Amino acid sequence: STGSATTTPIDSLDDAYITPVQIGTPAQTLNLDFDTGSSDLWVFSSETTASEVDGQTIYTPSKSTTAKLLSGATWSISYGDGSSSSGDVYTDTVSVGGLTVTGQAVESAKKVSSSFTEDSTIDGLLGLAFSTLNTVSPTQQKTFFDNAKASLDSPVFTADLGYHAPGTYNFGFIDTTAYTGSITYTAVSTKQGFWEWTSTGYAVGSGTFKSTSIDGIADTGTTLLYLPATVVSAYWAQVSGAKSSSSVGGYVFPCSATLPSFTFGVGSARIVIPGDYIDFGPISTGSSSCFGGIQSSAGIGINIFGDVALKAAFVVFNGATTPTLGFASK
Numbered sequence: 001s002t003g004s005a006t007t008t009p010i011d012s013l014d015d016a017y018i019t020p021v022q023i024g025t026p027a028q029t030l031n032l033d034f035d036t037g038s039s040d041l042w043v044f045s046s047e048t049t050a051s052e053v054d055g056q057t058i059y060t061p062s063k064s065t066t067a068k069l070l071s072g073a074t075w076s077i078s079y080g081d082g083s084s085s086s087g088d089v090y091t092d093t094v095s096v097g098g099l100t101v102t103g104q105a106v107e108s109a110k111k112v113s114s115s116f117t118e119d120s121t122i123d124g125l126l127g128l129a130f131s132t133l134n135t136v137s138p139t140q141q142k143t144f145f146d147n148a149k150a151s152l153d154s155p156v157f158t159a160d161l162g163y164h165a166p167g168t169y170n171f172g173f174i175d176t177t178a179y180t181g182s183i184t185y186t187a188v189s190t191k192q193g194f195w196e197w198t199s200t201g202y203a204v205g206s207g208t209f210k211s212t213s214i215d216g217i218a219d220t221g222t223t224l225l226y227l228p229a230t231v232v233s234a235y236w237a238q239v240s241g242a243k244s245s246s247s248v249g250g251y252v253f254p255c256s257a258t259l260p261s262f263t264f265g266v267g268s269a270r271i272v273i274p275g276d277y278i279d280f281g282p283i284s285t286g287s288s289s290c291f292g293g294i295q296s297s298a299g300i301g302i303n304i305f306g307d308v309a310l311k312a313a314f315v316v317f318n319g320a321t322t323p324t325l326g327f328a329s330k
Helices: 143-152 231-236
Strands: 003-009 016-021 030-033 042-044 068-078 084-096 097-110 124-127 156-160 167-171 185-186 196-204 210-218 225-227 241-246 250-252 260-268 269-273 279-282 289-292 295-296 303-305 314-318 323-328
Touching: 003 084, 016 156, 030 042, 030 084, 042 084, 068 097, 068 210, 196 231, 210 225, 231 250, 231 295
Parallel strands: 030 124, 042 097, 210 303, 225 295
Antiparallel strands: 003 016, 003 167, 016 030, 016 084, 042 124, 068 084, 084 097, 156 167, 156 314, 185 323, 196 210, 196 260, 225 303, 241 250, 250 289, 260 269, 279 289, 314 323
């Protein structure tokens, strides 16, 4: 089997991407944020505290003939940005782009943090990290990908995120028309439950490539690129007037700037992030200070290759017995 679904930016800045997912019988279609940095499939639901729902589409398990309460199971998750959600659990049929899993754990939110309430475009998350991070208790549950894997033509999924444009998530096959050149594969550590890999270095604009190992995670559920302070300082030093603002919460730059590209290494290959991808626009409406798309990971505790990086590539999440990651230009 295979699946293929279009993923669409939620706004003009590509702050996140949503992908339609069919849940239950008859299908209830919710737009979920596919997140390779977490491992819970959770949704706004008929059980979500009413005051915490503001425009989202909800899953109503009582209207699904295939839904069944997973008795005694609860979940609770806290994300790196401080957002959170929690609730109870159903199993139901879940389909993505024509690929169907029966008996998928669908985590129904009873509570969500304000950041979720305030974003009407995200109806929940679909986690695609390793199932060891799944928060369901007392019986940990598998991700959609882990449940699907045995049925897939090949045990892979791919992320092809667009810059200010829709893109694609494919399951079970590699679309050889979706990238240029060759795919470079690189080792993954699953020890922390993430798609964790080591970049071979970086360059800023037309500058020389710096060979240096940068351990980080491939995370479709994080907007920006978070790298060591040394690397980030070297980037922003090439933008006149750029500075780190403690009040804003990161590097800002004059909206009049032309940003340089940023290159990261994957083995002996190179992925180039165009400067435009690093512009996240005015810090507040009408401001001439713009927010940067490359930020320091100091204080996070891990480097994160979020959407800013991933959208510059065709990315293969290879879930073979020994997982690997592949990157191609596109």
